[PDB]
Design an enzyme around this catalytic site. Sequence first.
Site, PDB file in Angstrom:
ATOM      1  N   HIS A  14       0.853  -1.309   0.166  1.00  0.00           N
ATOM      2  CA  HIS A  14      -0.074  -0.064   0.186  1.00  0.00           C
ATOM      3  C   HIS A  14       0.959   1.160   0.134  1.00  0.00           C
ATOM      4  N   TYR A  29       1.678   5.504  -2.144  1.00  0.00           N
ATOM      5  CA  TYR A  29       2.148   6.798  -1.671  1.00  0.00           C
ATOM      6  C   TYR A  29       3.247   7.302  -2.012  1.00  0.00           C
ATOM      7  N   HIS A  63      -9.178   1.572 -11.203  1.00  0.00           N
ATOM      8  CA  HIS A  63      -9.046   2.738 -10.172  1.00  0.00           C
ATOM      9  C   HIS A  63      -7.662   3.181 -10.304  1.00  0.00           C
ATOM     10  N   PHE A  64      -6.392   2.109 -10.449  1.00  0.00           N
ATOM     11  CA  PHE A  64      -5.090   2.629 -10.276  1.00  0.00           C
ATOM     12  C   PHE A  64      -4.817   3.376 -11.865  1.00  0.00           C
ATOM     13  N   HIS A  65      -4.902   2.974 -12.895  1.00  0.00           N
ATOM     14  CA  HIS A  65      -4.544   3.857 -14.014  1.00  0.00           C
ATOM     15  C   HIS A  65      -5.039   5.227 -13.958  1.00  0.00           C
ATOM     16  N   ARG A  93      -9.597  -9.033 -13.513  1.00  0.00           N
ATOM     17  CA  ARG A  93      -8.344  -8.406 -13.813  1.00  0.00           C
ATOM     18  C   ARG A  93      -7.203  -9.558 -14.111  1.00  0.00           C
ATOM     19  N   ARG A  94      -6.224  -9.183 -14.675  1.00  0.00           N
ATOM     20  CA  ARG A  94      -5.221 -10.040 -14.879  1.00  0.00           C
ATOM     21  C   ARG A  94      -5.439 -11.480 -15.894  1.00  0.00           C
TER      22      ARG A  94
HETATM   23  C1  HAS Z   1      -0.370   6.228  -6.810  1.00  0.00           C
HETATM   24  C2  HAS Z   1      -1.484   5.398  -7.129  1.00  0.00           C
HETATM   25  C3  HAS Z   1      -2.416   4.941  -6.178  1.00  0.00           C
HETATM   26  C4  HAS Z   1      -3.140   5.844  -5.114  1.00  0.00           C
HETATM   27  C5  HAS Z   1      -3.211   7.109  -5.073  1.00  0.00           C
HETATM   28  C6  HAS Z   1      -4.180   5.192  -4.866  1.00  0.00           C
HETATM   29  C7  HAS Z   1      -5.215   5.512  -3.906  1.00  0.00           C
HETATM   30  C8  HAS Z   1      -6.084   4.907  -3.097  1.00  0.00           C
HETATM   31  N1  HAS Z   1      -6.198   3.391  -3.449  1.00  0.00           N
HETATM   32 FE1  HAS Z   1      -5.530   2.232  -4.842  1.00  0.00          FE
HETATM   33  N2  HAS Z   1      -6.631   0.947  -3.903  1.00  0.00           N
HETATM   34  C9  HAS Z   1      -7.475   0.902  -2.792  1.00  0.00           C
HETATM   35  C10 HAS Z   1      -7.557   2.351  -1.988  1.00  0.00           C
HETATM   36  C11 HAS Z   1      -7.332   3.237  -2.367  1.00  0.00           C
HETATM   37  C12 HAS Z   1      -7.852   4.389  -1.665  1.00  0.00           C
HETATM   38  C13 HAS Z   1      -8.464   4.553  -0.264  1.00  0.00           C
HETATM   39  C14 HAS Z   1      -7.316   5.534  -2.302  1.00  0.00           C
HETATM   40  C15 HAS Z   1      -7.101   7.012  -1.696  1.00  0.00           C
HETATM   41  O1  HAS Z   1      -5.753   7.321  -1.270  1.00  0.00           O
HETATM   42  C16 HAS Z   1      -7.879   8.015  -2.520  1.00  0.00           C
HETATM   43  C17 HAS Z   1      -8.076   9.365  -2.155  1.00  0.00           C
HETATM   44  C18 HAS Z   1      -8.274  10.372  -3.285  1.00  0.00           C
HETATM   45  C19 HAS Z   1      -9.104  11.242  -3.230  1.00  0.00           C
HETATM   46  C20 HAS Z   1     -10.344  11.515  -2.329  1.00  0.00           C
HETATM   47  C21 HAS Z   1      -9.051  12.379  -4.579  1.00  0.00           C
HETATM   48  C22 HAS Z   1      -8.724  13.721  -4.003  1.00  0.00           C
HETATM   49  C23 HAS Z   1      -8.823  14.604  -5.462  1.00  0.00           C
HETATM   50  C24 HAS Z   1      -7.822  15.512  -5.873  1.00  0.00           C
HETATM   51  C25 HAS Z   1      -6.536  15.455  -5.370  1.00  0.00           C
HETATM   52  C26 HAS Z   1      -8.030  15.871  -7.328  1.00  0.00           C
HETATM   53  C27 HAS Z   1      -8.668  17.524  -7.279  1.00  0.00           C
HETATM   54  C28 HAS Z   1      -8.695  18.016  -8.330  1.00  0.00           C
HETATM   55  C29 HAS Z   1      -8.002  19.276  -8.826  1.00  0.00           C
HETATM   56  C30 HAS Z   1      -7.333  20.000  -7.784  1.00  0.00           C
HETATM   57  C31 HAS Z   1      -8.177  19.854 -10.321  1.00  0.00           C
HETATM   58  C32 HAS Z   1      -8.867  20.892 -10.276  1.00  0.00           C
HETATM   59  C33 HAS Z   1      -8.561  21.940 -11.394  1.00  0.00           C
HETATM   60  C34 HAS Z   1      -9.350  22.549 -12.402  1.00  0.00           C
HETATM   61  C35 HAS Z   1      -8.879  23.367 -13.377  1.00  0.00           C
HETATM   62  C36 HAS Z   1     -10.975  22.375 -12.301  1.00  0.00           C
HETATM   63  C37 HAS Z   1      -8.017  -0.538  -2.503  1.00  0.00           C
HETATM   64  C38 HAS Z   1      -8.729  -1.015  -1.208  1.00  0.00           C
HETATM   65  O2  HAS Z   1      -8.641  -0.286  -0.068  1.00  0.00           O
HETATM   66  C39 HAS Z   1      -7.313  -1.225  -3.263  1.00  0.00           C
HETATM   67  C40 HAS Z   1      -7.515  -2.792  -3.404  1.00  0.00           C
HETATM   68  C41 HAS Z   1      -8.853  -3.168  -4.131  1.00  0.00           C
HETATM   69  C42 HAS Z   1      -8.732  -4.675  -4.419  1.00  0.00           C
HETATM   70  O3  HAS Z   1      -9.746  -5.440  -4.336  1.00  0.00           O
HETATM   71  O4  HAS Z   1      -7.758  -5.167  -4.583  1.00  0.00           O
HETATM   72  C43 HAS Z   1      -6.320  -0.539  -4.101  1.00  0.00           C
HETATM   73  C44 HAS Z   1      -5.349  -0.956  -5.198  1.00  0.00           C
HETATM   74  C45 HAS Z   1      -4.767  -0.310  -5.966  1.00  0.00           C
HETATM   75  C46 HAS Z   1      -3.886  -1.049  -7.016  1.00  0.00           C
HETATM   76  C47 HAS Z   1      -3.899  -2.340  -7.273  1.00  0.00           C
HETATM   77  C48 HAS Z   1      -2.733  -3.127  -6.719  1.00  0.00           C
HETATM   78  C49 HAS Z   1      -2.705  -4.678  -7.162  1.00  0.00           C
HETATM   79  O5  HAS Z   1      -1.804  -4.717  -8.113  1.00  0.00           O
HETATM   80  O6  HAS Z   1      -3.605  -5.423  -6.694  1.00  0.00           O
HETATM   81  C50 HAS Z   1      -3.037   0.099  -7.213  1.00  0.00           C
HETATM   82  C51 HAS Z   1      -1.804  -0.005  -8.313  1.00  0.00           C
HETATM   83  C52 HAS Z   1      -3.399   1.196  -6.500  1.00  0.00           C
HETATM   84  C53 HAS Z   1      -2.961   2.394  -6.697  1.00  0.00           C
HETATM   85  C54 HAS Z   1      -3.286   3.719  -6.004  1.00  0.00           C
HETATM   86  N3  HAS Z   1      -4.259   3.706  -5.346  1.00  0.00           N
HETATM   87  N4  HAS Z   1      -4.407   1.055  -6.013  1.00  0.00           N
HETATM   88  C1  HEM Z   2       0.255   3.233 -22.548  1.00  0.00           C
HETATM   89  C2  HEM Z   2      -0.486   3.393 -21.223  1.00  0.00           C
HETATM   90  C3  HEM Z   2      -0.900   2.571 -20.513  1.00  0.00           C
HETATM   91  C4  HEM Z   2      -2.146   1.323 -21.373  1.00  0.00           C
HETATM   92  C5  HEM Z   2      -2.534   1.412 -22.446  1.00  0.00           C
HETATM   93  C6  HEM Z   2      -2.129   0.526 -20.155  1.00  0.00           C
HETATM   94  C7  HEM Z   2      -3.382  -0.729 -20.050  1.00  0.00           C
HETATM   95  C8  HEM Z   2      -3.358  -1.647 -19.051  1.00  0.00           C
HETATM   96  C9  HEM Z   2      -4.217  -2.414 -19.033  1.00  0.00           C
HETATM   97  C10 HEM Z   2      -5.331  -2.800 -20.002  1.00  0.00           C
HETATM   98  C11 HEM Z   2      -4.266  -3.452 -17.833  1.00  0.00           C
HETATM   99  C12 HEM Z   2      -4.864  -4.419 -17.398  1.00  0.00           C
HETATM  100  C13 HEM Z   2      -4.325  -5.684 -17.601  1.00  0.00           C
HETATM  101  C14 HEM Z   2      -4.961  -6.797 -16.783  1.00  0.00           C
HETATM  102  O1  HEM Z   2      -5.807  -6.723 -15.849  1.00  0.00           O
HETATM  103  O2  HEM Z   2      -4.900  -8.087 -17.390  1.00  0.00           O
HETATM  104  C15 HEM Z   2      -3.031  -2.412 -17.154  1.00  0.00           C
HETATM  105  C16 HEM Z   2      -2.025  -3.243 -16.203  1.00  0.00           C
HETATM  106  C17 HEM Z   2      -1.243  -2.368 -15.257  1.00  0.00           C
HETATM  107  N1  HEM Z   2      -1.113  -1.301 -15.472  1.00  0.00           N
HETATM  108 FE1  HEM Z   2      -0.992  -0.299 -17.024  1.00  0.00          FE
HETATM  109  N2  HEM Z   2      -1.146   0.910 -19.161  1.00  0.00           N
HETATM  110  C18 HEM Z   2      -0.600   1.821 -19.247  1.00  0.00           C
HETATM  111  C19 HEM Z   2       0.500   2.396 -18.686  1.00  0.00           C
HETATM  112  C20 HEM Z   2       0.513   2.166 -17.399  1.00  0.00           C
HETATM  113  C21 HEM Z   2       1.358   3.154 -16.387  1.00  0.00           C
HETATM  114  C22 HEM Z   2       2.081   4.267 -16.985  1.00  0.00           C
HETATM  115  C23 HEM Z   2       1.130   2.672 -15.125  1.00  0.00           C
HETATM  116  C24 HEM Z   2       2.148   2.903 -14.124  1.00  0.00           C
HETATM  117  C25 HEM Z   2       2.639   3.960 -13.653  1.00  0.00           C
HETATM  118  C26 HEM Z   2       0.525   1.387 -15.432  1.00  0.00           C
HETATM  119  C27 HEM Z   2       0.603   0.054 -14.563  1.00  0.00           C
HETATM  120  C28 HEM Z   2      -0.123  -1.112 -14.784  1.00  0.00           C
HETATM  121  C29 HEM Z   2      -0.063  -2.123 -13.690  1.00  0.00           C
HETATM  122  C30 HEM Z   2       0.589  -2.052 -12.456  1.00  0.00           C
HETATM  123  C31 HEM Z   2      -1.064  -2.774 -13.752  1.00  0.00           C
HETATM  124  C32 HEM Z   2      -1.581  -3.988 -13.183  1.00  0.00           C
HETATM  125  C33 HEM Z   2      -0.927  -5.386 -13.622  1.00  0.00           C
HETATM  126  C34 HEM Z   2      -1.054  -6.706 -12.837  1.00  0.00           C
HETATM  127  O3  HEM Z   2      -2.164  -6.802 -12.379  1.00  0.00           O
HETATM  128  O4  HEM Z   2      -0.220  -7.475 -12.446  1.00  0.00           O
HETATM  129  N3  HEM Z   2       0.134   1.458 -16.689  1.00  0.00           N
HETATM  130  N4  HEM Z   2      -2.629  -1.416 -17.875  1.00  0.00           N
HETATM  131  O1  PER Z   3      -3.134   0.759  -3.187  1.00  0.00           O
HETATM  132  O2  PER Z   3      -4.404   1.525  -3.049  1.00  0.00           O
HETATM  133 CU    CU Z   4      -3.685   0.088  -0.948  1.00  0.00          CU
END
Ligand code: HAS
Ligand code: HEM
Ligand code: PER
Ligand code: CU
Lengths: 166, 552, 31
Positions: free
Chosen positions: B225, B229, B376-378, B441-442
């Site tokens: 996790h 961050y 979610h993560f993309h 997924r995967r």
């Molecule tokens: C860097 C990437 C990551 C962040 C950030 C992240 C955030 C969260 N995650 Fe996550 N996620 C989970 C919980 C969350 C929650 C609570 C948040 C929180 O941190 C989210 C809080 C964020 C907000 C409440 C958004 C605030 C909004 C902002 C900051 C934008 C404002 C916009 C502006 C300012 C623009 C305005 C401008 C104008 C011009 C209008 C959960 C479970 O509780 C799982 C497992 C689910 C499962 O069944 O596997 C999970 C799984 C994943 C996986 C899958 C891992 C795997 O391979 O199995 C990855 C890669 C990941 C990445 C990331 N995750 N997440």
């Molecule tokens: C060219 C842009 C991108 C496309 C077209 C893309 C698309 C994909 C797709 C369709 C999946 C899901 C595959 C599956 O569940 O079997 C995936 C997996 C993944 N993506 Fe990407 N990808 C992008 C770039 C990246 C980037 C930059 C991140 C990280 C910074 C990212 C990290 C991941 C990881 C961690 C997974 C999950 C792998 C796993 O379950 O083992 N992707 N993406």
């Molecule tokens: O890692 O959400």
């Molecule tokens: Cu997590």
Amino acid sequence: DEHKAHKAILAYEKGWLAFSLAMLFVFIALIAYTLATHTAGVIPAGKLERVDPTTVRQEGPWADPAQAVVQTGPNQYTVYVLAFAFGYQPNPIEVPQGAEIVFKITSPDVIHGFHVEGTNINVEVLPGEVSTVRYTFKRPGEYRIICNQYCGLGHQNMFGTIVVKE
Amino acid sequence: SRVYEAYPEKKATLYFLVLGFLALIVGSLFGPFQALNYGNVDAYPLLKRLLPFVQSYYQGLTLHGVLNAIVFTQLFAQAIMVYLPARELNMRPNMGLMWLSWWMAFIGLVVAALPLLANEATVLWTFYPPLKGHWAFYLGASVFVLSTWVSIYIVLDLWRRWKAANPGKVTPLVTYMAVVFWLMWFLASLGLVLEAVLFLLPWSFGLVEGVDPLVARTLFWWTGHPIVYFWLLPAYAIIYTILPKQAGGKLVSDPMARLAFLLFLLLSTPVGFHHQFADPGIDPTWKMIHSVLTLFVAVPSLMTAFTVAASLEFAGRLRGGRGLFGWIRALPWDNPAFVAPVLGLLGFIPGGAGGIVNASFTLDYVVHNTAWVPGHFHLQVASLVTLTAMGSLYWLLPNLTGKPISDAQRRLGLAVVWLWFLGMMIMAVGLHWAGLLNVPRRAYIAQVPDAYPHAAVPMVFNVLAGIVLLVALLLFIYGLFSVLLSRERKPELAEAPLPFAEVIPEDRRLVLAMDRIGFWFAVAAILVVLAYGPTLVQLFGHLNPVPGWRLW
Amino acid sequence: KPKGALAVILVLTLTILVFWLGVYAVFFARG
Ligand code: HAS
Ligand code: HEM
Ligand SMILES: [O-][O-]
Ligand SMILES: [Cu+2]
Ligand SMILES: CCCCCCCC/C=C/CCCCCCCC(=O)OC[C@H](O)CO
Ligand SMILES: CCCCCCCC/C=C\CCCCCCCC(=O)OC[C@H](O)CO
Ligand SMILES: CCCCCCCC/C=C\CCCCCCCC(=O)OC[C@H](O)CO
Ligand SMILES: CCCCCCCC/C=C\CCCCCCCC(=O)OC[C@H](O)CO
Ligand SMILES: CCCCCCCC/C=C\CCCCCCCC(=O)OC[C@H](O)CO
Ligand SMILES: CCCCCCCC/C=C\CCCCCCCC(=O)OC[C@H](O)CO
Ligand SMILES: CCCCCCCC/C=C\CCCCCCCC(=O)OC[C@H](O)CO
Ligand SMILES: CCCCCCCC/C=C\CCCCCCCC(=O)OC[C@H](O)CO
Ligand code: CUA
């Protein structure tokens, strides 16, 4: 103007941070609720129940799939499921509708998913552990089991079947 | 160069960036193919002619995961969260150590790569036992990640040195962020390190017959996790301390910024069970505790949303914009370094929203292990983090090389940024939606084409996303090389200040409390013991190791 | 007042809510 914008920005952010906190708390309260209903049956049992995946197909409740479905209550069945590369036994699983089904699921090889399409059953199956989950099928018919944890080259075609009898 | 003689940290930083992007490019080659797959279109025969070493969809998936989510993101973090505090403090990081960290990263990455390319470790980026990879994969990955412990040292060094020359002064903003970040990363890192040293390495070396799957996963998600961050905070540092300059305004609060970081130190690590909601042998009371804590770690981004939105509005107002929407048009939308992050933040709205659902213990049973998760993560990492990193090309590269960005290059940067953003959004729709339709997924679904008929609609999105992102990626390749391999050099660019924003007075009391770092570090570490201790003690007390397998 | 910022968090609150009650509804349908 700069001084004023600053105070007003800060003032409202506190508003927001308190509302966001409220909203999060309400979700906590709504999760708490689910925890208290039958819908919570699908949460795994936190208890450790170790087995030997090298002998599980030769001895114990997983060894004879035709006997996997055991009545353990007046309206309750325990089902010993094996998730393995690449399928589930028995196939199909046959359970009565309206009955409460305690699935006890393990693997002889690698981790598999056990996700029952159409329901909230979605549990990781780890070799060496038995995953225990509970569900009451309310509608009769055919439910697909999907493996949703990568388990090797046969992952995409690993499917099972639960049949719920009227 | 005379500039590298005086700022050697520029060149080590550059090496982290370039290697990072190179990792990003190669990892990303597999993306469009995966997108086409989630759209039920099978273009692997194509990929296998173009890249003959590729044996399966899952080899490709591993490479993608490892190179994009582990390698790229890390290099980036080490580039940003070292160089930035170094510039703000105007002090020289320990150059021997910085080079050591680079070589570790490069060496480890090279070693891990060999098995990956050889098809000897088609586990994935999560490497869950008993799928058993080549020792080189685990060892190469371990040394790669360990590279960061040096970075931690470097930044604590710089920090203490500054405090020694400046007793009774509060830590400066970027440095405060960098410190809480690295200390956070330290605690976090221990889960995986433990896993690799006690289980994965001996195991893969043949020193033990098997590993306990559940302990592996529990240790894994200890690190797993906070890693996200660790990926995010480099972007936030920039979004907070740089973007406001780029947008034409100021950061509306240093204390708020510090607070968010501080919260991530305290709350990024004790939460991992939220990846183990569907796991046996983990008590439900612990799942609920971890869930609650996960909802809390949402708070600093909830904060960030407002702090940052308010800063962008302020910039927009400063540049003449009026109304409810006027400040938006007023911003420097012609500038890729502003655009890339802001667009990233837009996608982050539905991103965090998905995260929030995932966190809620029983709600996770709806989406767990479906295409929803990738959805979610993309949004979070492939979009926000990646775009932020992309937009740094247009201010950091020149700062590090004296290589100038032409007007033409800038226009292409804009195109790349928008297409990537948009392709990520389209994909985000197809995945979330396919996920809600129970698609796993995967999974190489294109090879079971009649398996998910109900997903026909979201599938078109994934195909579309697939083509759009291939274009964006192609254009980023050409883009990056054009700048990198460019002729001209303007050394006045390398000697420019970084565009750090000014802050708009004040809770000095708060800042002082937040500055008692050792104290906050301990607290955070106590929280990990309280939240992981009881469970790990029970797991270690009943180990049940199982034979490994190679199913590829 | 920071009217634009506020509007950003409205969108965000609505997104969270559409998402969350959305899934909660799906959790119970499948229950
Ligand atoms: C860097 C990437 C990551 C962040 C950030 C992240 C955030 C969260 N995650 Fe996550 N996620 C989970 C919980 C969350 C929650 C609570 C948040 C929180 O941190 C989210 C809080 C964020 C907000 C409440 C958004 C605030 C909004 C902002 C900051 C934008 C404002 C916009 C502006 C300012 C623009 C305005 C401008 C104008 C011009 C209008 C959960 C479970 O509780 C799982 C497992 C689910 C499962 O069944 O596997 C999970 C799984 C994943 C996986 C899958 C891992 C795997 O391979 O199995 C990855 C890669 C990941 C990445 C990331 N995750 N997440
Ligand atoms: C060219 C842009 C991108 C496309 C077209 C893309 C698309 C994909 C797709 C369709 C999946 C899901 C595959 C599956 O569940 O079997 C995936 C997996 C993944 N993506 Fe990407 N990808 C992008 C770039 C990246 C980037 C930059 C991140 C990280 C910074 C990212 C990290 C991941 C990881 C961690 C997974 C999950 C792998 C796993 O379950 O083992 N992707 N993406
Ligand atoms: O890692 O959400
Ligand atoms: Cu997590
Ligand atoms: C500049 C970056 C943006 C790029 C956006 C490009 C737009 C995608 C193409 C649209 C035209 C419609 C294409 C329809 C023609 C063929 C479709 C088809 O027949 O489907 C495939 C086949 O059935 C199964 O393999
Ligand atoms: C189903 C649930 C219903 C959700 C529907 C969307 C709700 C939008 C979210 C928050 C509103 C908070 C805005 C209230 C204004 C706070 C005032 C404030 O904090 O202002 C301090 C300052 O001193 C004054 O000048
Ligand atoms: C200022 C206002 C202060 C008041 C703040 C309160 C916020 C109200 C929201 C939710 C309460 C939770 C209600 C819990 C009821 C859940 C029942 C449900 O959804 O039932 C599902 C299913 O039908 C059964 O099996
Ligand atoms: C912008 C994105 C738009 C998002 C669009 C949302 C569409 C998904 C809606 C609900 C999923 C719920 C699926 C629940 C499955 C019920 C099917 C069922 O009950 O089938 C099995 C049964 O055994 C037969 O006998
Ligand atoms: C189904 C999802 C796929 C569809 C994708 C939609 C997602 C949101 C896209 C863009 C919103 C950006 C809003 C702000 C746009 C900035 C442009 C602007 O305001 O331009 C002014 C002019 O250039 C003076 O500088
Ligand atoms: C010029 C830039 C703008 C152009 C942007 C495009 C417009 C967006 C909408 C749809 C494109 C869809 C392309 C998808 C390609 C084929 C889809 C497919 O494979 O469909 C299968 C069908 O449902 C069963 O056979
Ligand atoms: C500006 C950037 C912010 C981006 C904000 C995006 C937030 C996502 C919100 C809505 C998408 C859902 C569309 C409508 C909901 C679909 C519900 C539905 O149709 O449910 C199926 C049910 O079974 C009946 O058939
Ligand atoms: C804009 C870019 C971001 C990407 C967009 C992400 C889309 C996912 C959003 C919301 C799903 C909310 C859950 C909605 C499920 C709808 C079905 C429903 O409402 O459920 C009732 C019915 O019983 C069912 O079986
Ligand atoms: Cu069994 Cu995937």
